[PDB]
Amino acid sequence: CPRFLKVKNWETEVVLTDTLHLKSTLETGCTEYICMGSIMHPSDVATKDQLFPLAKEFIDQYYSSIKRFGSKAHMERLEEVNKEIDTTSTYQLKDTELIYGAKHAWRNASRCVGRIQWSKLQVFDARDCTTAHGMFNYICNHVKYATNKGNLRSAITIFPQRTDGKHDFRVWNSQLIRYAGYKQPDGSTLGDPANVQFTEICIQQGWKPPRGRFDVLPLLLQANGNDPELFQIPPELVLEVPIRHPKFEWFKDLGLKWYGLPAVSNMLLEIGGLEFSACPFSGWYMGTEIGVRDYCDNSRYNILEEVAKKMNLDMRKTSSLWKDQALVEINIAVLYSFQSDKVTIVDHHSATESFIKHMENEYRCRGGCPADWVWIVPPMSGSITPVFHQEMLNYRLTPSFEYQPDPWNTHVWK
Amino acid sequence: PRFLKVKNWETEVVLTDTLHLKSTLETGCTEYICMGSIMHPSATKDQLFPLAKEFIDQYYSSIKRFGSKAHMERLEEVNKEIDTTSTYQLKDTELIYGAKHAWRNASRCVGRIQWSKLQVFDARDCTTAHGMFNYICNHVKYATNKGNLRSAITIFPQRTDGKHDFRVWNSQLIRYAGYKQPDGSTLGDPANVQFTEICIQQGWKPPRGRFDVLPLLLQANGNDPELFQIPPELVLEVPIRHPKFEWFKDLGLKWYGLPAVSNMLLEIGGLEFSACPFSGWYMGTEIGVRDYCDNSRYNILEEVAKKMNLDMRKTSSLWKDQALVEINIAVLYSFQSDKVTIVDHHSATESFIKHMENEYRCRGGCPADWVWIVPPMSGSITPVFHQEMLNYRLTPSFEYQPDPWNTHVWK
Ligand code: HEM
Ligand code: HEM
Ligand SMILES: CN[C@@H](C)Cc1cc(C#N)cc(OCc2ccc3c(C)cc(N)nc3c2)c1
Ligand SMILES: CN[C@@H](C)Cc1cc(C#N)cc(OCc2ccc3c(C)cc(N)nc3c2)c1
Ligand SMILES: C[C@H](O)[C@H](O)[C@H]1CNc2nc(N)[nH]c(=O)c2N1
Numbered sequence: 001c002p003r004f005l006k007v008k009n010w011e012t013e014v015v016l017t018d019t020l021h022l023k024s025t026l027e028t029g030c031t032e033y034i035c036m037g038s039i040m041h042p043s044d045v046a047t048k049d050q051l052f053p054l055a056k057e058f059i060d061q062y063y064s065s066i067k068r069f070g071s072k073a074h075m076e077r078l079e080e081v082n083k084e085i086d087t088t089s090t091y092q093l094k095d096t097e098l099i100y101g102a103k104h105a106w107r108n109a110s111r112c113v114g115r116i117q118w119s120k121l122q123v124f125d126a127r128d129c130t131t132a133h134g135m136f137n138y139i140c141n142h143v144k145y146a147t148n149k150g151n152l153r154s155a156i157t158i159f160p161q162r163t164d165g166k167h168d169f170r171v172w173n174s175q176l177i178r179y180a181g182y183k184q185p186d187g188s189t190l191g192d193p194a195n196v197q198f199t200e201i202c203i204q205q206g207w208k209p210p211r212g213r214f215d216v217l218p219l220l221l222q223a224n225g226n227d228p229e230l231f232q233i234p235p236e237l238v239l240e241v242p243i244r245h246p247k248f249e250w251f252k253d254l255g256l257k258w259y260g261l262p263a264v265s266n267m268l269l270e271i272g273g274l275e276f277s278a279c280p281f282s283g284w285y286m287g288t289e290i291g292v293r294d295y296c297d298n299s300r301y302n303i304l305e306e307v308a309k310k311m312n313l314d315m316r317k318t319s320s321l322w323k324d325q326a327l328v329e330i331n332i333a334v335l336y337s338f339q340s341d342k343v344t345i346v347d348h349h350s351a352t353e354s355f356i357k358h359m360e361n362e363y364r365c366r367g368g369c370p371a372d373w374v375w376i377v378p379p380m381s382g383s384i385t386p387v388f389h390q391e392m393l394n395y396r397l398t399p400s401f402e403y404q405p406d407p408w409n410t411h412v413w414k
Numbered sequence: 415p416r417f418l419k420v421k422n423w424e425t426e427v428v429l430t431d432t433l434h435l436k437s438t439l440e441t442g443c444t445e446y447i448c449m450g451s452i453m454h455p456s457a458t459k460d461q462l463f464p465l466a467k468e469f470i471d472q473y474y475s476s477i478k479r480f481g482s483k484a485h486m487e488r489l490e491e492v493n494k495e496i497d498t499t500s501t502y503q504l505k506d507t508e509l510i511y512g513a514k515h516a517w518r519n520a521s522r523c524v525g526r527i528q529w530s531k532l533q534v535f536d537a538r539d540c541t542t543a544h545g546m547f548n549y550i551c552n553h554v555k556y557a558t559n560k561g562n563l564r565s566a567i568t569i570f571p572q573r574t575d576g577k578h579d580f581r582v583w584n585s586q587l588i589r590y591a592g593y594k595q596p597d598g599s600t601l602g603d604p605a606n607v608q609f610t611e612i613c614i615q616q617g618w619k620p621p622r623g624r625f626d627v628l629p630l631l632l633q634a635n636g637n638d639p640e641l642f643q644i645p646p647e648l649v650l651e652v653p654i655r656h657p658k659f660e661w662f663k664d665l666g667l668k669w670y671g672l673p674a675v676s677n678m679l680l681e682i683g684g685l686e687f688s689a690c691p692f693s694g695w696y697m698g699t700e701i702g703v704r705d706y707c708d709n710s711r712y713n714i715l716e717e718v719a720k721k722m723n724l725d726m727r728k729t730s731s732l733w734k735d736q737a738l739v740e741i742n743i744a745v746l747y748s749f750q751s752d753k754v755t756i757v758d759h760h761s762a763t764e765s766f767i768k769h770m771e772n773e774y775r776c777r778g779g780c781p782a783d784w785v786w787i788v789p790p791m792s793g794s795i796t797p798v799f800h801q802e803m804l805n806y807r808l809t810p811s812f813e814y815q816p817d818p819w820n821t822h823v824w825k
């Protein structure tokens with residue numbers, strides 16, 4: 001209960017009706033008496049009996065999408081998978097199923113504002129991979145293809161699935177391209193403070209760090225449960241953008257740059273009960289991700305103060321909104337720079353307007369669209385974007401991208 | 415089951431929530447569906463006494479006299495009043511305790527660090543709209559205090575058989591009128607166009623200006639509501655001007671000093687107070703972001719950006735964002751210069767983080783709606799963005815209720 005749930009937009013009064021929520025799979029963390037919608041994470045292998053029903057649910061869904069439900073091919077496929085599970089305790093997805101499942105894990109990502117693009121996703125099948133060097137090769141081809149000389153194209157590379165859990169493939173990097181952070185003996189931090197831990201691990205694994213402010217990190221790659229291995233990404237594959245400002249000539253003097261390709265590589269892709277622990281995917285940036293969070297978080301590069309000083313701002317009282325003012329200019333500079341270098345990027349106004357349109361269409365064609373308001377609303381100027389006033393329902397559909405523990409906590413070193 | 419941790423991801427501070435286990439009202443969410451962004455997820459004597467007992471229990475627990483002679487006596491007193499009269503009346507102390515804790519339990523309010531500095535005016539002896547007018551005038555005058563605003567609530571008689579409700583039909587004691595123009599646009603505040611028409615329907619003579627203070631529309635004891643004009647000397651207003659942009663005053667914007675929400679229902683120990691206007695002071699973004707820049711509101715971004723001579727052809731110039739900051743700078747500067755109490759979203763969110771820490775320490779938790787606590791501009795550079803919160807509904811509480819004109823049958 002109940003079969004229908006309505007959502008309202010308070011700016012346009014448009015009302016949508018959600019039926020899709022009935023296919024919700026996992027719990028949210030919420031209950032009837034408490035809501036955990038702003039908890040970041042409100043959360044060995046699957047057995048045979050656990051697995052048939054999960055496999056059947058996905059196979060049914062797949063044949064339902066290609067308008068072949070209850071067909072000979074549908075029934076044959078079910079028998080094939082069931083027997084494979086019974087004799088091998090797992091099964092293998094057909095290429096078509098893998099591609100469908102990957103696109104739908106994105107489509108089901110309630111925290112992603114970018115989902116209007118979900119069906120155009122290049123899927124690279126890397127399930128024949130056996131070694132870290134091969135992971136490196138696949139990852140390089142992913143980066144080059146996705147980057148496309150600035151004209152970014154979303155893609156995902158999927159490595160072999162978990163078997164017994166002692167042979168996992170993992171990208172130890174949280175993103176394929178990130179900058180190193182170095183904590184200094186005086187307590188201060190050079191580079192990106194978000195990445196200090198991973199940096200220290202790379203250095204321990206033998207990485208010789210240049211110890212600069214924007215040193216691209218090496219790939220740390222684990223195949224088939226083996227100790228991970230370091231590889232330098234070829235610099236010519238790493239597209240970068242110097243941040244300048246269209247009016248403040250001094251902004252370049254800050255010496256800021258960022259990388260063009262956002263590629264998240266530490267999440268788990270779940271399809272019909274199968275677990276792909278290495279599945280790096282990439283899109284293009286929303287400006288705020290760099291300009292608000294990456295640059296202006298106190299736990300990040302934290303340049304608000306420095307920018308505001310160069311803007312001659314009164315910085316003694318907060319009620320002057322010097323931070324707010326600085327933040328806007330910084331995000332203006334980010335968008336300007338990317339646009340000027342013909343590197344794909346979306347501003348938070350465009351993106352949120354697109355998501356609203358995507359959401360409504362999803363309600364029309366699919367009977368709903370799970371969305372996480374806390375993550376969908378941009379980290380600046382929320383109420384002047386249309387998502388702010390839009391009621392949303394959040395729930396877990398499958399296939400899905402999931403969080404997984406950092407590998408260095410679980411790895412049994414050889 | 416279980417204590418629950420919330421984590422601040424900026425400071426890594428972790429608080430342990432136990433208070434949620436005393437929650438008894440539902441949130442709207444389920445195991446499988448979160449509804450945290452739905453605005454509103456949708457008595458006889460038999461139901462009343464347990465509700466009453468629960469409130470009395472926690473009251474005497476608050477004054478450290480649980481199980482006392484007076485406590486048990488109060489219980490036998492309330493029970494006897496309920497089967498006799500099908501209701502019961504709160505002691506003055508219980509009323510004060512009740513009102514403050516309804517503020518304290520308000521998940522959506524970032525101003526709760528002030529919750530126990532609340533001036534309670536008991537207006538349960540009121541019988542007429544004229545009496546209601548008088549109580550309200552005294553509230554406004556006391557709360558405004560010449561710009562040094564003071565928090566207050568005025569509580570009118572509780573609901574009885576539901577046919578004799580007291581209602582303030584205004585959504586705030588002080589609001590500006592909104593008029594549906596001949597060309598289909600809107601003069602004044604567009605959020606109030608319906609209420610404004612209702613007042614005109616009752617005989618209000620509209621100045622049909624941009625910032626016309628609406629009359630009070632007051633319903634006593636289930637009777638038809640009556641119009642009253644607030645004496646203008648009680649209505650503190652601020653001309654909005656900019657510290658650097660001299661042309662900003664030429665926009666001709668003003669706002670009122672006193673935010674006084676008057677359309678909610680106060681629930682204490684099973685008793686329903688359908689008229690209970692409460693007031694505090696403004697966080698600047700309430701006016702500068704919402705009242706002024708919401709598309710369904712005054713919507714002045716366009717005009718301001720023009721005066722700032724910004725590039726407005728493409729959205730990726732963040733011209734809306736720039737104009738928004740300036741408007742909010744103007745609002746804070748204007749109130750401050752006129753010595754009218756106001757708080758900015760940086761200072762307000764700081765205070766709330768400190769308030770959370772207090773409540774976890776002394777109360778074992780604090781219900782908080784991240785969706786409403788995070789300010790509508792500059793979210794992630796305020797400390798509440800990075801603050802995990804748990805949301806649950808404690809009682810006493812403020813509740814939503816229907817607009818009286820959807821319910822009321824005239825005579
Ligand atoms: C194509 C352009 C895309 C844009 C503009 C975009 C935008 C965003 C943004 C702004 C976030 C919030 C990020 C944060 O605050 O950390 C997000 C989250 C997310 N995105 Fe997208 N994204 C894009 C592509 C993709 C693709 C291709 C996938 C998967 C195939 C994807 C999957 C996800 C997931 C799973 C999350 C949430 C991660 C979590 O649960 O913490 N996105 N996206
Ligand atoms: C003293 C200064 C106060 C400040 C700065 C403040 C701030 C705020 C803000 C910014 C909101 C969000 C409003 C919106 O965006 O519509 C809010 C909501 C709320 N406030 Fe406060 N507040 C204050 C005092 C009070 C008082 C005195 C009461 C009652 C005793 C109160 C009860 C509430 C309630 C019940 C809500 C949520 C209403 C809803 O559920 O829609 N607040 N507050
Ligand atoms: C500082 N807080 C972050 C660490 C939270 C976060 C964690 C993880 C994980 N694991 C994954 C996350 O993914 C966000 C994300 C994922 C994919 C994106 C793509 C493909 C494109 C894009 N522009 N942004 C993305 C943003 C975020
Ligand atoms: C446009 N969205 C609003 C209509 C949502 C809203 C509804 C109601 C009701 N009923 C009551 C609301 O009250 C918000 C509120 C309540 C009290 C406040 C006090 C006492 C002070 C202050 N500065 N802001 C307040 C803000 C809001
Ligand atoms: C505490 C809070 O839930 C947490 O900081 C969330 C809030 N919303 C967010 N939204 C986005 N897009 N990204 C984030 O990292 C976060 N962080």
Ligand SMILES: C[C@H](O)[C@H](O)[C@H]1CNc2nc(N)[nH]c(=O)c2N1
Pocket residue numbers: 010388389390391392450451452453785786787
């Ligand atoms: C749909 C959504 O819940 C609604 O627009 C909320 C979002 N957060 C808000 N937060 C505050 N403070 N005030 C509001 O009116 C709203 N509106």
Ligand SMILES: [Zn+2]
Pocket residue numbers: 030034035036037443444447448449450
């Ligand atoms: Zn919830």
